[PDB]
Amino acid sequence: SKEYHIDEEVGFALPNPQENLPDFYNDWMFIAKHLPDLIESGQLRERVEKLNMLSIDHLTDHKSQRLARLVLGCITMAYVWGKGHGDVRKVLPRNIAVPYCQLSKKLELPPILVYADCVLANWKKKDPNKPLTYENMDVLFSFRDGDCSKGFFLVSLLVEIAAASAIKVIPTVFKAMQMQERDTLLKALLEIASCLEKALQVFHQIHDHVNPKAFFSVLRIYLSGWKGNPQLSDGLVYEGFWEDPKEFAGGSAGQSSVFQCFDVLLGIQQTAGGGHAAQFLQDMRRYMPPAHRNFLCSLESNPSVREFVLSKGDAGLREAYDACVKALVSLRSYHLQIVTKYILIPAGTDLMNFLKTVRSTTEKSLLK
Amino acid sequence: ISKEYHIDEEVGFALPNPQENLPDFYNDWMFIAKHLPDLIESGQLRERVEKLNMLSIDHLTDHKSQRLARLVLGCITMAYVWGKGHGDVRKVLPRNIAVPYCQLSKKLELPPILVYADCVLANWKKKDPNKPLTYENMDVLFSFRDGDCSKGFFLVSLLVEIAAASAIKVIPTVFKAMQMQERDTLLKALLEIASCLEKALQVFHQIHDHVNPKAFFSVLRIYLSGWKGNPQLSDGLVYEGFWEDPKEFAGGSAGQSSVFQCFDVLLGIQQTAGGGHAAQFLQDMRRYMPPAHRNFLCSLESNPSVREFVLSKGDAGLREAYDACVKALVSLRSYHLQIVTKYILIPASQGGTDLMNFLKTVRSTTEKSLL
Ligand code: HEM
Ligand code: HEM
Ligand SMILES: O[C@@H](Cn1c2ccccc2c2ccncc21)C1CCCCC1
Ligand SMILES: O[C@@H](Cn1c2ccccc2c2ccncc21)C1CCCCC1
């Protein structure tokens, strides 16, 4: 569909994002395009404080509003965390905080860098006529030299794209259930598992493009927010826009709509139950684009694919459903091996118990 | 016309014509629920719950019977857990009532605890079927204690839920007028909605006639509170025979009412958006609405914003019509805010003050929505 902003080729990713803002915002674009140098030289916070308050009125369309959210978002994290060694700022200056909050209010997103900014909207094609492959793609913004932010973002983006192939089968699933078309539903579930199995092979590229100590000690710092953070115990002051400081969670892949979408489709009660994992994945929906929030909730309004398969006494239909659940377990299991390489060894123990709980919930959803 | 969603033309989100009696197979359940005041005060409610046999849910054939069974099992559960309402708490719900309550709640996609849709939307009847829906012609189906003001509290909420129903049927007219670009139809629709919300404010005044501040704070409030962030059941309540761990579920609230969230969504009042505790609370309370009412709120959020439509037109008449609805929402919460001060703030001085900071936040969000 169209009002959910789900593309045929890139799915939840923003199709063909905008790389440049109008000349009116050149003072923004220069800072965001040179974050590794302005941070390393100890001049980023000065350049930010010298900016004049630019109006968001010249951001006329959707794509340019998403780019400015990415620009202002990357500068905010660069201003709050600085060099990423402890010298923080608990007040975001109004010349960049007021337009950030105004733009975030308009796009119904929190004023902090989220997954839909630094992954779904932070990419470009090198050559337009060539396909969406890692060698033909690039990110628009980074934080530090050697933060491996290109590999981390683009590999997440590429797994998102690989999962988009399964997203377009979803309407066939619900149509087959309503029309009681058993053979069509089986073929569709097998196709959804096939696409999720291709996405697992895409995931393997993470070792080639992401370095362990680079992600743990650099990129992770600039992606963390100010909710439950001892460094900003009461949040961030959004100067000129809010009286009190506000708390917002740093970016996450719980913000990725892809995995939440198949949890709902297959009846994997991730957001139910009551655990911290349930509440966290539920809260991270507030950090998705509004169109993608509505898509997840619209899947939850449809009849359960799980209860349909359980009620038929159909072996071939339970295996096709199990192939979809199995593909989700395979992804989170391989992803769990990635987190031990990139987080546990460089170190955190709560992340494992969170991921193991999400994976545990998925594996217990199998029928055999 | 709205589909279902389960929204009535006359009573809106309330259950139309609730069932008063379960089949004979469940006579052991109905006897306890119908005699809570005597069984609680005499201290023999918990015994008669424990010597119940584990009845099956298969004999609740239709929707209205399952909603009544959710109402009776919900009232017995609060009575069992809170007892006489003075501190002696049970942390274990016996299996012969825990597993049919959880089985039935699993089927209706609701959590195993009394919610607004139980004790308000499904907890009423007409005294005379032919006479209109007024306070004098209505009555609740269940109460906790004698003098808990549960009749006046449940029916006054129910009456303004009906008063809002007149504005819910105009919602399809609002979105069709935007899609088909009918400016005059939309303006008339927004004015019709604002009028109904102003009709509902007058119904709200009956709260002083039929509710007592001391009876609500010290009696009815105890039986409606739940086991989520509660120092009396810090880990939750164990539903014996169904879950091995204790589970936390929030007490009944009017944040579970769909009418006020429904108009926040329609007017683009970003209540659930933002990071505040009030935004987190109102989103969490949707998990406590009936599934058809959850899906209706979701369906509204998927439609284009009525607010951005009115802002983009440069139309003074359209803005005044949109402002009349926001003004009507501010007037309701403001009057409701003065009710809480008489019924919660003053009895507390012989949650707490967080109830006031919560309601002032949602009112401020509604008030700042003006143009
Ligand atoms: C070096 C690579 C990666 C690291 C270090 C990493 C780390 C983490 C951590 C620590 C979490 C849980 C805490 C939190 O989300 O805040 C998480 C969650 C998640 N990650 Fe990753 N991740 C990596 C790659 C990926 C990729 C490429 C994807 C592609 C879709 C992905 C998908 C997810 C999802 C869906 C979640 C939410 C939890 C779940 O649904 O199981 N991760 N990641
Ligand atoms: C004694 C009379 C009343 C009292 C003491 C009372 C108290 C409260 C309190 C404390 C809250 C927010 C706290 C919470 O639920 O956890 C609340 C919310 C609410 N009440 Fe009431 N209430 C009363 C009557 C009514 C009536 C008649 C209605 C009409 C439906 C109503 C509608 C609501 C709604 C919709 C909310 C959600 C909060 C919001 O407006 O955003 N209340 N009430
Ligand atoms: O890496 C993030 C989690 N996370 C993201 C955060 C922001 C933007 C994207 C992601 C992300 C993307 C894919 N997998 C995990 C992800 C971080 C979460 C807090 C603990 C360290 C790891
Ligand atoms: O007043 C109730 C909230 N509440 C309900 C709870 C259960 C069922 C209905 C209601 C309700 C209905 C209207 N207003 C407030 C309401 C309670 C809120 C939490 C603090 C103690 C007082």
Curated annotation (Swiss-Prot), chain B:
Keywords: Cytoplasm, Dioxygenase, Heme, Immunity, Iron, Metal-binding, Oxidoreductase, Tryptophan catabolism
Gene3D superfamilies (UniProt xref): 1.20.58.480
GO MF annotations in UniProt: electron transfer activity; heme binding; indoleamine 2,3-dioxygenase activity; metal ion binding; tryptophan 2,3-dioxygenase activity
Cofactor note: Binds 1 heme group per subunit. In the active form, the heme iron is in its ferrous state Fe(+2). The catalytic cycle does not alter the oxidation state of the heme, but IDO1 is prone to autoxidation.
Compartment annotation: Cytoplasm, Cytosol
An example Gene Ontology CC term for this record: cytosol
Tissue specificity note: Expressed in mature dendritic cells located in lymphoid organs (including lymph nodes, spleen, tonsils, Peyers's patches, the gut lamina propria, and the thymic medulla), in some epithelial cells of the female genital tract, as well as in endothelial cells of term placenta and in lung parenchyma. Weakly or not expressed in most normal tissues, but mostly inducible in most tissues. Expressed in more than 50% of tumors, either by tumoral, stromal, or endothelial cells (expression in tumor is associated with a worse clinical outcome). Not overexpressed in tumor-draining lymph nodes.
Cofactor(s) named in the record: heme b
EC number in record: 1.13.11.52
Subunit field text: Monomer.
This protein's name: Indoleamine 2,3-dioxygenase 1
Organism expressing this protein natively: Homo sapiens
